[PDB]
């Protein structure tokens, strides 16, 4: 086509989706990770994670308002990844890298798994 | 913070949101523009438009599944802007610029209004 493109559009959409999340506006699911609960938008979760894409395209699970993650999943690891989904920013630290990588593998977030593997290989 | 950032993340999220829209997955509103209907995600509309942000933060209108736009709004103009919201790409042409600009003013999409004004000024 002969379209023009607004460079900052995708980033501005994501910033607003994060603002809606922070204010709990039109959030439609709560992700339970052991004792912790995280409110989010199903569409953002699906757009970022192979696991959530699978879950919310399922004819029964698409209608659930609560999703319980595997008890082995670390809440901090999930929190870091949820923040990444809504911001493009990953808070990767020596103290959380193993939990972040395990959570990204479970959530099927290939680019996160890739940078975790690379940061681990550099420290060995 | 000491975060790392994935450059293509925002663009990849938007591409997936557009894929969900095309497959009518978790769309939660229909925008009626005279004889035409457009299915979309309330959160994407709010993240792109001052008008939709106002509408879906309203305590009564947030729950509506159908939103009827002003009868003066051109369906093609709306279609072009809806595509822009989900892609960052604006199909701006001599034959549609007036309708696109009028629709962007109504929807409160300042960056679109700005490029329309500039393209019009260049042709006079």
């Amino acid at each position: 086509d002969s379209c023009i493109q607004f460079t900052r559009h995708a980033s501005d959409v994501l910033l607003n989706l994060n603002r809606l999340r922070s204010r709990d506006i039109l959030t439609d699911v709560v992700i339970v990770v052991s004792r912790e609960q995280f409110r989010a938008h199903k569409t953002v979760l699906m757009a970022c994670s192979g696991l959530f894409y699978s879950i919310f395209t399922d004819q029964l699970k698409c209608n659930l308002s609560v999703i319980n993650l595997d008890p082995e999943i670390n809440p901090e690891g999930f929190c870091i990844l949820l923040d990444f989904m809504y911001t493009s920013r990953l808070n990767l630290r020596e103290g959380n890298i193993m939990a972040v990588m395990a959570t990204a593998m479970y959530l099927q977030m290939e680019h996160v798994v890739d940078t975790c593997r690379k940061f681990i290989k550099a420290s060995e | 913070d000491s975060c790392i950032q994935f450059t293509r993340h925002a663009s990849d999220v938007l591409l997936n949101l557009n894929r969900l829209r095309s497959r009518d997955i978790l769309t939660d509103v229909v925008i009626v523009v005279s004889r035409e209907q457009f299915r979309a995600h309330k959160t994407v509309l709010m993240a792109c438009s001052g008008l939709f942000y106002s509408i879906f933060t309203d305590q009564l209108k947030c729950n509506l599944s159908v939103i009827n736009l002003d009868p003066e709004i051109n369906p093609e103009g709306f279609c072009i802007l809806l595509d822009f919201m989900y892609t960052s790409r604006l199909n701006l042409r001599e034959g549609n610029i007036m309708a696109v600009m009028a629709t962007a003013m109504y929807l409160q999409m300042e960056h679109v209004v700005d490029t329309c004004r500039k393209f019009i000024k260049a042709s006079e």
Binding site: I4, Q5, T7 | R89, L90
Partner: peptide, 4 residues
């Protein structure tokens, strides 16, 4: 705005 750019030509993509």
């Amino acid at each position: 705005w750019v030509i993509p």
